[PDB]
């Protein structure tokens, strides 16, 4: 149950939010978000 899954996940995602976290590093390259703008709002 828990005894197997948790340590399994601990290994699978040890790079979590580190320099080896490719998804997160890619996310950090994203420009700061500007709020939605819509023309002709009336």
């Amino acid at each position: 149950d828990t005894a197997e899954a948790v340590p399994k996940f601990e290994e699978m995602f040890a790079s979590r939010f580190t320099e080896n976290d490719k998804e997160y590093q890619e996310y950090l390259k994203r420009p700061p978000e500007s709020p939605p703008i819509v023309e002709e709002w009336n």
Binding site: D1, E33, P35, P36, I37, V38, W41
Partner: protein, 310 residues
């Protein structure tokens, strides 16, 4: 009121998200749609499902006062005798992270076409067993082809701001997030405080989406898509029905303001992006936008959808 448009926008997000997967389900099923509203709150989505013409809805939440209040709204909606059809409904007080919903349903053989979990999932990641239990209650009784859709904070954005902050806090006049510690982020029980001036002040847990993705596989779920709130918006506003809805729901604030009205924010540069925008060759006015303060608070969220395999 300061948060007036923040609310409407978030409600629009749910409307369009719900809308998209109601259309997909109906494309496959062609019959009575059954839906589980997990962590239903006081029934902020009752109207959305009414507009969607589903046949049965199951509303469940940990807060008993909320659930009954949700029930009360629904009774008021059905008891307003008009011509509109309304789903049959069922209301269950329950901790969906420690209790099995299937044992609580009126019908032991109950199945759903859609589980809608809006702003709830991250409370379950207090521990693995709770996260697994909520995922199980959300996905196990999904009809094949059904969906698990919802909204939850983007841990990527949360950690990004946390580590960029001088302290363990970050936010503005509208929201506040407080971690106990940076650099250490457990897969479960990563606790932070969340305060949104007008909606919440309630401890939450970090949700590492690759983890949620993995855990969901346990119940034969494949990822349909995961999007930041900006990305989802950028796609959905490409459809004029969604855009007209955005206006009707007043999900953006008109800019610039009337001489006689007021912008919602008094903050000095909260609308610089809008001002800069109309400094290019002429814009058709007025603009619809959101205060920078409000966007900071809501851009933290992502949308996700999983599909139950065949």
């Amino acid at each position: 009121s300061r948060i007036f448009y923040l609310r409407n926008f978030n409600n629009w997000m749910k409307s369009v998200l719900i809308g998209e997967f109601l259309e997909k389900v109906r494309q496959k099923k062609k019959r009575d749609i059954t839906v589980l509203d997990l962590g239903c709150g006081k029934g902020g989505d009752l109207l959305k499902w009414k507009k969607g013409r589903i046949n049965k809805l199951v509303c469940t939440d940990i807060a008993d006062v909320s659930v009954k209040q949700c029930q009360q709204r629904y009774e008021d909606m059905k008891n307003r005798r008009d011509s509109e059809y309304i789903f049959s409904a069922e209301f269950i007080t329950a901790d969906s992270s420690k209790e099995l919903l299937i044992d609580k349903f009126r019908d032991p053989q109950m199945c759903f076409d859609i589980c809608s979990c809006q702003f709830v999932c991250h409370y379950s990641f207090e521990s693995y067993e709770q996260a697994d239990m909520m995922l199980r209650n959300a996905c196990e009784r999904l009809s094949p082809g059904g969906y698990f859709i919802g909204t939850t904070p983007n841990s990527f954005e949360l950690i990004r701001r946390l580590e960029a902050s001088e302290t363990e806090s970050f936010g503005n006049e509208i929201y506040t997030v407080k971690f106990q510690k940076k650099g250490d982020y457990p897969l479960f029980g990563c606790k932070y405080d969340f305060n949104l001036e007008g909606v919440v002040d309630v401890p939450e847990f970090l949700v590492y989406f690759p983890l949620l993705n993995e855990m969901a596989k346990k119940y034969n779920m494949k990822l349909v898509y995961k999007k930041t709130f900006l990305e989802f918006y950028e796609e959905k506003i490409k459809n004029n029905e969604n855009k007209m809805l955005l206006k009707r729901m007043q999900a953006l604030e008109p800019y610039p303001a009337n001489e006689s009205s007021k912008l919602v924010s008094e903050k000095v540069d909260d609308y610089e992006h809008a001002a800069k925008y109309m400094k290019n060759s002429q814009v058709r006015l007025p603009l619809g936008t959101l205060s920078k303060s409000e966007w900071e608070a809501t851009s933290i969220y992502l949308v996700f959808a999983f599909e139950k395999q065949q």
